[PDB]
Design a protein around this ligand. Structure first.
Ligand SMILES: OC[C@H]1O[C@@H](O[C@H]2[C@H](O)[C@@H](O)[C@H](O)O[C@@H]2CO)[C@H](O)[C@@H](O)[C@@H]1O
Length: 582
C-alpha cells in the first residue's frame, strides 16, 4: 500500500528471510549496514577519495596517531548525540563478541580513545605497523549506539537481539525499518535526519524489497516495471532495452554491461580431510572449466581471475603481480591457471591418490576424496550452473563432489561457520589498499574463527599460515612501494604452493535500473557514484543522486573532491598529511 512514485523497489539484494537489524547478530538483513549505520568517512572508490560523513575532519598528530573530529550535528535518530564513546564502544564490543563492525581492528590499532565528547583518537600498533589498516579502521570506523546496546546487554544476549521495532530503532543513517513480513522488507526515510543540512535528504521516502525465490522470478518483476533498482544476474541483459524496448539500463550500454565488483573464489575448506592437502586444492584449480563456465553460466559478464588475487582489469594494479612467477608456475602467457584435466589427474597421481573400485580417489593415508558438496544459494542461477560444471569435472578426476543449493540463510551459516566443503563466494574488490585487502581477507588466520563459529571478517576456508601473517605485518610498515611489492610477490609464491582457495573470476557489480519512476541513475554517461549496486556496502550515495521523474533535482553539491567543488578528501592528500606528520 506504498506510494509508488515515492518508493524505490529493489531486487537482487535480499535473498531468503529477514533475520535481524543487528550487526552483532550472526545474520542481519540487507539494508542494515548499507543504510542504517554510517561511517566516520565513506570511501569513494570512483574518485579515490573520502566523504567526511559522521566525521567533520581528521588530523594526524603524528604518523601513528589520528584524531577524528565528529560533527556537532551527528546525532542518533532518538536524539542522543553521536559521541566518541560510540566509536570506542562499537570496536570494543566487536573485539569482545568476536563478531561485528570493524573486525580485526585490534591487530593493527593499539587503542581507540574518546579524548573528548566529539573527538576520537586512534593509535597505530608499532610492532606490526600497517599504515593501510591504520587508515582503514580509523577513517572507516562505524560508531554504534552505546546507550542502546548497554540496555540490550542488561536484558539479554546481544547476539539474540533482533532490533525489529521500527519506532525504537536507533540509527545514524537516513533510513530505518518500516515494515517486514515473509515476502518483503521496507525501509522508510528519517525526515529529520541529522545530516539534512550537510548532505540533503535521499530522494526516496521508501525502499522496498520483495523477496523473490530465484533469479527468473526477480527478472520477471524487473521486466514488468516492478523493480527500480536491481542487483541481479540477468541472462542476455541487453535485450531488455534492445528487443523488449523497456525503460531499463546498466552502467555500460555495451558489453561487458557491468563494472567489476571483486574476485569470486572457489573456496575449499582447509579443515576437511582430503581438502586439507594442497595437492588436492591444486588439482581442483586445474579442473575448473574457466572459459566454458564464464561463457555459458556467466554470459561473459566477467573474466577469469589472475591466481595472484590481484585484479588486473586495472592497469595500475599490474605492478603488484609477479608475472614471471605466474608464467613459470602455470605455463600460460599471463600466468592464469589453464583448464587442464590431464594436469589435474597428474597432480593427484603424483600425490599418491589412487582411484578405488567406485572411481573415487583414496590417498596414501588412505583418506577418501569424498563425499563432498559444492554449494551456493538457491536461485543464484549463474553460480548454480558454475557449481554443476565444476562438480562434474571434479567427479571425472575422482573427487566425489555433488551440488547442494540451500536457502541463502543456510548457505551463509555454513560458509561463515566453515562447515562447508566447497563453495563459490566473494572476497573484496578494487580499493586504495588493493591487493593488501584481498590477502588480508582471504589468507589471514587472525580474521578466521573456529569451525562452528561465525566469521564475516575473512578466511572462511580456515587457511592457517604464519608466514602470511608476518608478510601482512611488514607489507605497509613503510610507504615505500617496493617493500609492499616484495611482500605481495612472496604471498603469491605461497598462494601457488598452498592453493589456499582458488581465485576463479572477476565478479560483476550487478546493477540495473528502471527510469519509469526514478531518473539520474549512475552510469557510464552519469558516473556520479562508482558503487551503485543495491547490495554493495557503499551503495548509499546512489539514493542522494537519483530524482523522482516528476521532481528532478540537481546533483548533491557535496559530491566531488575539494578541488572539484565538493567535500571529498583525496586519498593522496591523506597520505600527504600522514608523511608530513612523521
Ligand atoms: O552472481 C551470483 C548472484 O549474485 C547476487 O548478488 C550478490 C552478490 O554477487 C554478492 O557479492 C553480494 O555479497 O550479495 C549479493 C546479493 O545480496 C545476485 O542477486 C544474483 O542474481 C546472482 O545470481
Amino acid at each position: 500500500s506504498l506510494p509508488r512514485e515515492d518508493t524505490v523497489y529493489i531486487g537482487g539484494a535480499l535473498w531468503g528471510p529477514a533475520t535481524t537489524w543487528n550487526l552483532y547478530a550472526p545474520q542481519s538483513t540487507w539494508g542494515t549496514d548499507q543504510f542504517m549505520y554510517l561511517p566516520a568517512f565513506q570511501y569513494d572508490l570512483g574518485r579515490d577519495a573520502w566523504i567526511p560523513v559522521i566525521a567533520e575532519r581528521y588530523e594526524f598528530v603524528d604518523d601513528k596517531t589520528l584524531r577524528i573530529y565528529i560533527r556537532p550535528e551527528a546525532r542518533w535518530s532518538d536524539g542522543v548525540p553521536i559521541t566518541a564513546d560510540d566509536f570506542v564502544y562499537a570496536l570494543e564490543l566487536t573485539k569482545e563478541l568476536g563478531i561485528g563492525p570493524g573486525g580485526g581492528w585490534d591487530t593493527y590499532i593499539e587503542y581507540v580513545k574518546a579524548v573528548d565528547t566529539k573527538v576520537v583518537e586512534f593509535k597505530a600498533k608499532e610492532e606490526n605497523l600497517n599504515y593501510f589498516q591504520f587508515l582503514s579502521y580509523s577513517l572507516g570506523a562505524q560508531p554504534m549506539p552505546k546507550h542502546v546496546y548497554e540496555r540490550i546487554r542488561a536484558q539479554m544476549n546481544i547476539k539474540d537481539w533482533i532490533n525489529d521495532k521500527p519506532e525504537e530503532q536507533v540509527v545514524s543513517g537516513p533510513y530505518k525499518l518500516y515494515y517486514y513480513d515473509p515476502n518483503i522488507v521496507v525501509y522508510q526515510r528519517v525526515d529529520d535526519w541529522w545530516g539534512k543540512d550537510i548532505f540533503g535528504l535521499p530522494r526516496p521516502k521508501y525502499l522496498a524489497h520483495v523477496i523473490y525465490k530465484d533469479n527468473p522470478s526477480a527478472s520477471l518483476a524487473f521486466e514488468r516495471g516492478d523493480i527500480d533498482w536491481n542487483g541481479l544476474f540477468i541472462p542476455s541483459v541487453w535485450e531488455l532495452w534492445e528487443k523488449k524496448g523497456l525503460p531499463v539500463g546498466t552502467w555500460y550500454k555495451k558489453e561487458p554491461y557491468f563494472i567489476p565488483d571483486g574476485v569470486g573464489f572457489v573456496y575449499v575448506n582447509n579443515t576437511k580431510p582430503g581438502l586439507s592437502d594442497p595437492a588436492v586444492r591444486k588439482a581442483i584449480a586445474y579442473a575448473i572449466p574457466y572459459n566454458e563456465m564464464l561463457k555459458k553460466a556467466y554470459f561473459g559478464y566477467g573474466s577469469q581471475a589472475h591466481p595472484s588475487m590481484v585484479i588486473d582489469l586495472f592497469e595500475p594494479y599490474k605492478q603488484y603481480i609477479d608475472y614471471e612467477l605466474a608464467k613459470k608456475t602455470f605455463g600460460t602467457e599471463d600466468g592464469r591457471i589453464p583448464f587442464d584435466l590431464d594436469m589435474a589427474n597428474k597432480i593427484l597421481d603424483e600425490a599418491g591418490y589412487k582411484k578405488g573400485p567406485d572411481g573415487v580417489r583414496v590417498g596414501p593415508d588412505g583418506t577418501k576424496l569424498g563425499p563432498y558438496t559444492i554449494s551456493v544459494p538457491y536461485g543464484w542461477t549463474d553460480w548454480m550452473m558454475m557449481c554443476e560444471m565444476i562438480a562434474k569435472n571434479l567427479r571425472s578426476i575422482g573427487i566425489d563432489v555433488k551440488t547442494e543449493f540451500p536457502d541463502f540463510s543456510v548457505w551463509a551459516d555454513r560458509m561463515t561457520k566453515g562447515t562447508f566443503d566447497l563453495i563459490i563466494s566473494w572476497s573484496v574488490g578494487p580499493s586504495f589498499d588493493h591487493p593488501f585487502n584481498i590477502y588480508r581477507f582471504v589468507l589471514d588466520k587472525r580474521l578466521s574463527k573456529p569451525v562452528g563459529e561465525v566469521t564475516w571478517a575473512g578466511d572462511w576456508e580456515r587457511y592457517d599460515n604464519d608466514e602470511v601473517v608476518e608478510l601482512l605485518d611488514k607489507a605497509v610498515s613503510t610507504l615505500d612501494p617496493e617493500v609492499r611489492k616484495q611482500a605481495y610477490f612472496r604471498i603469491q609464491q605461497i598462494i601457488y604452493r598452498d592453493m589456499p582457495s582458488i581465485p576463479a573470476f572477476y565478479t560483476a557489480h550487478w546493477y540495473e535500473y528502471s527510469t519509469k519512476y526514478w531518473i539520474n541513475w549512475p552510469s557510464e554517461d552519469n558516473p556520479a557514484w562508482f558503487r551503485p549496486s543495491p547490495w554493495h556496502a557503499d551503495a548509499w550515495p546512489t539514493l542522494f543522486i537519483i530524482s523522482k521523474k516528476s521532481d528532478p533535482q540537481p546533483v548533491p553539491s557535496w559530491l566531488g573532491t575539494v578541488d572539484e567543488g565538493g567535500i571529498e578528501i583525496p586519498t593522496a592528500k591523506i597520505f600527504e598529511d600522514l608523511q608530513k606528520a612523521t
